[PDB]
Symmetry: C2
Subunit: 542 residues, 2 copies
């Protein structure tokens, strides 16, 4: 009659550009699948490269690196006899020739099946998302060809992420003989996204009658948090397996012929629990993937910075977080008392630095122009900028990142100060409306699993080469996306090319907060240059 | 002969009223010159590029109302037809679903004749590389538009429609004898050569003359250079308008044959780049309603260049220079800074930073006990200067123009909130090598009585939160019209206050650190708005 297929769902937390580490994570997942006796392992969208790599996908050397990593991966999977692996990767058709300026022609968002240490086949994405947070029509060409393969007597069809948004890809896969659809995803979290996913896949299942296996990335990548939540629906649309959100790992699910069999279904999290876990994972990964030693948080004594402190301690542990209160002459005693209280509750280092001497000095320096004028936002903003300068000094001297505490409501109506309360590396609650800030504090105070309860005070809740050389290397690397080896071949030293290009990468975080400026070249540091901050891509010099 | 007016207009994103006034003024001039036809640039009516305004149903409603008003205002110009670009949504403020591809929104150009829209072209090939993202906003249409004026058939294609053979072929098969091309083509060095080459590839395939009308003016990072031109049916250049200037020019056709007209004199690459910087500064200040500019002067070449550009853009009376010496700033620097400001005739002030710096040092002395002073203390100094310039900006309203160059941006020789503190980074795309060339250019281009801007020595050296949040969610997250937010039970006062502050503070959000997305419409890549915008939505 029918055979069983034992499938490992690899809900991986890969890192943009970290080919070596990503290969190691996929191999580790494969080892675990082998240890469990699986026939088949499925990894997420663009697992090999991490996701989304943004304008790395315009750089020929990035695709060359991906191809080399895919070959390394296949070699390392070869020892797992009988285990096939479906892995996402960027693909350029048959290397370092320029990527033109004109639409994508021969680059694809792909998933390849590796069998016996060789690529057995490849699917290329059809429906490229180019709305919201994605710009895949900037990077990839479309392909309409289905990919169906046989494994344990069952025909499996592959489609990738937003291919499920319309009828077309699934119908082409079914017409090519698919009996089960396999879907690698890089689907970022938002509130109610878990419901959206199951609704869209049910629409496809109504049309095709085919069960669907949905495997998602997990982890933080700059503004995005991938929540995992991989799942399986049977051919009637019933949920038969569901992995936890916001956790990395592997789960085993089974099929008997084309029938999806029941497995573990993680209980649903409340919307508040999902949002809080997103914030924790985002902070944990922005610090971890970038290699920061810890975090600094300016505490006002108010609820916004209280939430950020709670999230940071949950993400990093108290030993890697410090809190700084910076009172002015106006600062109420209850504010410093409240700030010190919460720092004690979570066991973080707490320091106070008075800003009056700096503020007095600024005020003195401007006395001639401002005298007799009403105090307004100008004076408040100077105070905020003094605070930003202090936190950035501590960050610059000892290396921890400043986590900023401006909420979405404040961002919206401009109740914030450039270079002041906005000064820092990562805006933890930039997408949390003030109303939700309160709800999340109540949530966390009650959430036993995090350890210490009631950490946010209840009372706040009821209230170089020379320039000619440097510029030449910049033009070739930045403006023209040339491989480092081609820059060296044009007559520049390996030492100079390495030094300049490393510094260009290192300083992405800084450029991304720069004021807008005037474009006069064909590749400026504006909309022409859309790079990840979190990235471990290091291109070989030769 | 057919007389065609090329309206090389400087429109403003969102400024429907003012853009209409500019087009009507151009039409008046054309009518006085006996023109049969006037051609305006790509998305002239709305300004270009409006970015995520093109996801907002009210923006298309405003555009339709503006097009109706324009047609009515053009009606007295008997005998003159006007081709105008505009965003178009097919037949009101029903939601534009942002989670699926555009379906019924187009980049359009309509011909107005006798005070009525006679016909409409919709763009076919949408740019979605470099600085453009039109596949986020618009659907493709491969229908041609060809009309007859003074006995000659004219076909319309829009900007990047010329990158491939298709649109021109479809127009020619629909009867076109001359192709008319509205553009929103931004400047970059050598872009002028790219434009003529691509149009010549099309003319090889069609044999039809082409009329290329381009936008001019600054729009956030972009500077549109104008440089509108005509090629005859063999690809010969027969007319060319100046770069970086607005104007109207008449070109004539004898039947379908393009006749020679004025060809503007050329500009060196340095001269072009310099004028782009001037126009960009002039328009960022002007279109955003800033009263003037503030520049931190170090005595070095970069801030000298930015001072020169600012004075040329705005006039000396709208620029002030501030030198902020530390205890040990070299005397040569403050003399050179003061001298530069005198030469261009601008207000100059010195504000010593040692008292602030000493106060920061004392406040951090326990924390930094035993450690050498290093880049950390240099950065504190840079941040003090940024705070000073921003205080002047905050109190009196002028924008701070920052002086970091492209080389510095590249390798990180710059300080967040310090030398990067300000509103507009004039030379962010000028490599250090090019800074020197532009200073030499500006010295070379000096007027009589003005001497070197830069000396040789230097060159060779609110409702409650529950209500606020509900209004934010409807306006920002859901792109709802203001009138619908009012109809949901919120006061006109509250809705106006909250939504005007959202717009006003775009400049500020755009310098914020990256943060975590948890909603379907965060202030990251979900929200791509122009800073320069005069879009004001009606409350009813």
């Amino acid at each position: 009659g029918s055979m069983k297929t034992r499938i490992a769902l690899a809900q991986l937390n890969v890192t943009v550009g970290d080919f070596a580490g990503n290969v190691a994570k996929i191999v580790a997942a494969a080892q675990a699948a082998h240890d469990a006796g699986a026939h088949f392992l499925i990894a997420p969208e663009l697992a090999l490269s991490g996701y989304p790599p943004e304008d790395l996908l315009l750089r020929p050397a990035f695709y060359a690196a991906s191809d080399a990593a895919l070959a390394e991966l296949a070699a390392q999977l070869k020892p797992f006899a009988g285990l096939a692996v479906l892995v996402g990767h960027p693909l350029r058709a048959p290397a370092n020739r320029a990527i033109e300026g004109v639409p994508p022609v021969d680059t694809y968002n792909a998933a390849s099946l590796i069998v016996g240490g060789e690529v057995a086949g490849t699917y290329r994405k059809q429906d490229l998302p180019n709305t919201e947070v994605f710009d895949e029509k900037r990077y990839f060409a479309t392909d309409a060809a289905p990919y169906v393969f046989e494994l344990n007597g069952v025909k499996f069809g592959v489609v990738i992420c937003e291919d499920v948004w319309h009828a077309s890809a699934a119908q082409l896969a079914k017409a090519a003989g698919a009996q089960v659809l396999i879907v690698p995803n890089g689907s970022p979290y938002h509130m109610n996204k878990d419901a959206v996913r199951i609704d869209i896949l049910r629409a496809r299942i109504r049309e095709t009658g085919l069960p669907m296996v949905y495997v998602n990335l997990v982890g933080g990548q700059d503004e995005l948090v991938f929540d995992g939540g991989s799942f399986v629906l049977d051919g009637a649309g019933e949920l038969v397996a569901k992995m936890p959100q916001f956790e990395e790992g592997n789960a085993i699910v089974e099929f008997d012929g084309a029938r999806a069999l029941p497995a573990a279904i993680a209980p649903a999290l409340s919307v508040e629990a999902q949002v809080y876990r997103a914030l924790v994972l985002g902070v944990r990964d922005y610090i971890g993937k970038n290699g920061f030693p810890g975090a600094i948080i300016g505490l006002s004594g108010g609820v916004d910075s209280a939430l950020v402190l709670a999230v940071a301690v949950d993400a990093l542990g108290a030993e890697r977080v410090r809190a700084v209160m910076m009172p002015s002459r106006y600062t109420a005693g209850i504010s410093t008392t409240d700030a010190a209280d919460m720092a004690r509750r979570v066991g973080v280092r707490y320091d106070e630095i008075a800003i009056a001497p700096m503020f007095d000095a600024f005020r003195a320096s401007l006395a001639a122009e401002f005298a007799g004028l009403a105090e307004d936002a100008t004076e408040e903003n100077i105070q905020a900028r003094i605070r930003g300068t202090l936190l950035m000094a501590l960050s610059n001297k000892f290396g921890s990142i400043v986590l900023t505490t401006g909420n979405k409501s404040e961002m919206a109506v401009g109740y914030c100060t450039l270079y002041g309360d906005m000064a820092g590396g990562f805006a933890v609650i930039k997408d949390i409306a003030k109303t939700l800030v309160y709800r999340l504090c109540r949530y966390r105070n009650a959430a036993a699993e995090y350890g210490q309860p009631d950490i946010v005070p209840e009372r706040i809740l009821t209230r170089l080469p020379p320039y000619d050389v440097l510029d030449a290397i910049m033009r070739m690397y930045m403006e023209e996306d040339r491989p480092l080896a081609e820059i060296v071949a044009a007559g520049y030293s390996e030492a100079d090319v390495k030094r300049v290009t490393r510094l260009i990468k290192i300083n992405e975080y800084k450029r991304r907060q720069a004021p807008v400026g005037i474009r006069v070249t064909h590749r400026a540091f504006g909309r022409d240059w859309r790079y990840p901050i979190t990235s471990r891509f290091v291109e070989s010099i030769d």
